[model samples]
Target chain A: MNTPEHMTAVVQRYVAALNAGDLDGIVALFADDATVEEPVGSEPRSGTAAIREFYANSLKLPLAVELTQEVRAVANEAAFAFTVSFEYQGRKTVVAPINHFRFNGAGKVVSMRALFGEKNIHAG
Target chain B: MNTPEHMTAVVQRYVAALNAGDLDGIVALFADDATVEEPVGSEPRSGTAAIREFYANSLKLPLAVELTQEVRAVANEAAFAFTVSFEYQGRKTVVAPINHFRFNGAGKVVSMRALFGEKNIHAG
Candidate 1:
């Protein structure tokens, strides 16, 4: 079982890596066969290679990410609320997503789901 | 499909009803065949009658429920962070949970999951 402290720490590092645009840092936190479903309803990226590609594409735009609330770590799962802000062309936009992470016995994140809809987004 | 506004409104009302300890009002927000999992790791109680019984037991102790952050409503689902504070004897306790609600076609909550770990509980 993952301790709440360890789970919370992982979430903190995730936001930090995102803000720094550290692709490898972000990808290293996951298990080799982890799945990432960004924005919930979309198809999930399976495995580390696919997840790495997904983050690589996302980092292409550059991002400012921060945790908006305290992380809720329960059992082997952790859920956190955060905002991702970026500029495309001259327009700046911010998307607030509540992300769910489930950790493996090894402490690596095995599954991740980012929940956000059009309504959670705002003009940055 | 449930609109973002409608979904978010339902969440607000649910929280309000919880704070008021209005058992019937809280039950009315669900579909007759809804499934509720107070905590994700537990077995779900299904159907309106079972749901009502579950909430009834919860309301046995009057609660002070409040939303702690902005609601995340996307697609046909909503996720929110909130705290349920109550006093038992001279000792007061607080639990901060992140809840996920999925709406059916009729806009009633079809499935609900409350996410909180031991770490989310506090002494009030």
Candidate 2:
């Protein structure tokens, strides 16, 4: 079983990686067979290859990422509240998403689900 | 797509139901084909029958459930931080979980995922 500290560390690393635009750093935390589901109802991207591609696209723009609350980590899972902001089409948008990560025996994330909707995305 | 207000209300209703030990009230908020995955890694309980059974086990003890923070609601989903406390053998156990809910067009919960690990469960 992964420690909550270990799982929370992974989430911190993930936020740091996103802010740094370190795509590889973000992908390195997942297991080879990990899956990522964004928006809850969409098809999840499975496997390391797909997961890497998904983040690559997310890194297309320089993102300002920050954790808005303390990470809630227990068992082998962690949930965190954070915001990712970027400028697109001359409009600045910020998306607040609560992302959940479940770790495998090896301490690598086996599953990730990002929950956010259009209302969570704000335009300024 | 359900409005964010509608989804958040369901979350509020869920917490109230849990506190009231209103199993039927909680089950009524779910879709007939809803699925629930508690602890993130468990096998999801599918359909109304299984969903009812799952919550029944949860309500075995009178639970003191409360929302610890504002609900993060957007799109057709809502994720919130909450605590459920119960006493067993004179030992009080409090579990803090971040639960995610997705609603269908009719505002019924279609999927629910509870994310928490061991450290989030405290014995006092």
Candidate 3:
């Protein structure tokens, strides 16, 4: 089996879908019952359907997720770290140094998790 | 117990050791019998004693490793991706997207793995 030189292509495609606000397309890359965890200080959502719902709401927010770097990729595992920016309820939010991704062999994302600063998730 | 915010301090200490040619200090951060998996295409050198030997040799080489980005970190798990440059047998080589790290709870680095582009090794 041949894998792309790097998961950059796969990641690029996924991000492109996100940039286009293609929620289904983004969810399509994940498994049917994928697990989702938001940045540590926040609650996590599980399963692809729920994940899509979360993204559905997320898409409405003006946000930008940029892959700052591709940290590492083994034959069957890849990891990345990114930065994000957005607005929620008329408030600006910046989520930098957020690491979110999955293992390669879990049907493309058997489990997806994220980690961010606490302030990003909670605000008065 | 106070955990450093985001492991930035820990990682910075590690990188500084690497830059300062402090192989022992690097090894000091690891648990005895720590596991190490060198870039996938090569045979993994497991265990701290063996890993120390591996790094001892690695330190002799003319190399520069720069941390480009840190992807994510939960309370006990942290990950970073980086790029490396070095000279071997008078041949200049680069190892980009090298992701090698360990979980935080395991005496610092109880497990360390590196993911890099092939040809970075087996340059013969």
Candidate 4:
């Protein structure tokens, strides 16, 4: 069952996976045919293979991912506010996004959309 | 064209209108044929007439509304985190939600979805 409690746990696990750079743990949270649209305007990565590859590339640099506020889960859908920070060549950047995940009946995340704009990204 | 700056202003105007209990101001931000799905899983109010009626009912109670974080606007879509609090029957309730808005080419909001659940609601 895709209860709010279960969905919230998935979100927590997702943040931990991102922070730990656990590609497998992150990919296992999605359905076989899940689609991920990061930053809203970019082309979506469809299916498990593409989603896995996307995360693989994303994990090249260790990320500091954490929830900025409480997660909002309802009607099998969850929307959370979080920050993803990474350091590259001594330069640090942080992006704050409101990400939404829609779960399928089987409780796997079937779709994910990350919403952020130029204003939400900061160079540190 | 719907620029991020303009869309972000709409979001700010929305919150201010809500705080002022300006029913017309809130309704004017949407397109004529827009759809509003507040709290996200409920039946949507379609078209300006229905939207106006819905907000009219909501304004029966004065609301304390404010943005919790920066507005994220991109790709004709915007999402922001905010809280809506109101008192009814001597009980104060606050609902924290991340609301997503999809804008039409004319810069009016075509779709609005508010994401929140039981846990996101606080009583004081």
What are the iRMS values of all candidates? 1.4, 2.9, 4.3, 0.7
Tell me the TM-score of model 4: 0.98
Q: What is the Å distance of residue A115 in model 2 from its true position?
A: 0.7
The digit string of per-residue lDDT tens for model 4 on B18-123 reads: 9998988999999999999988788899998999998998888888998999999999999999998999999999999999999999999999999999999999
Measured against the true two-chain complex, the DockQ scores of the candidates, in the order shown, are 0.66, 0.40, 0.32, 0.89
| Clash-forming residue pairs, model 1 | none
With candidate 4 superimposed using the best TM-score fit, by how many Å does residue A3's alpha carbon deviate from the native? 0.7
Model 1 chain A poorest 10 in a row by lDDT: A68-77
Model 1 global lDDT (CA atoms, 0 to 1): 0.90
Q: Cα lDDT of model 3 overall? A: 0.62
Cα error, residue B40 of model 2, in Å, equals 4.4
Give per-residue lDDT, candidate 4, residue B36: 91
Model 2 per-residue lDDT at A68: 78
* Model 2 chain B lDDT-worst window of ten: B68-77
For residues A28-83, write the lDDT of model 2, one tens digit per residue. 99999999999776889999899999999999988999987678886778899888
Candidate 3 chain A lDDT trough over 10 residues, lowest sum: A115-124
**Rank by TM-score, descending?**
4, 1, 3, 2
Among all candidates shown, the one with the greatest lDDT: 4
> How many pairs collide in each candidate, listed in order?
0, 5, 3, 0
Candidate 3 lDDT by residue in tens digits, B9-105: 5666677788788888888877776777776546777667897888888788756777775444455445566666777677877676544455545
Best by TM-score: 4
TM-score of each: 0.93, 0.74, 0.77, 0.98
- Sort the predicted structures by DockQ, highest score first: 4, 1, 2, 3
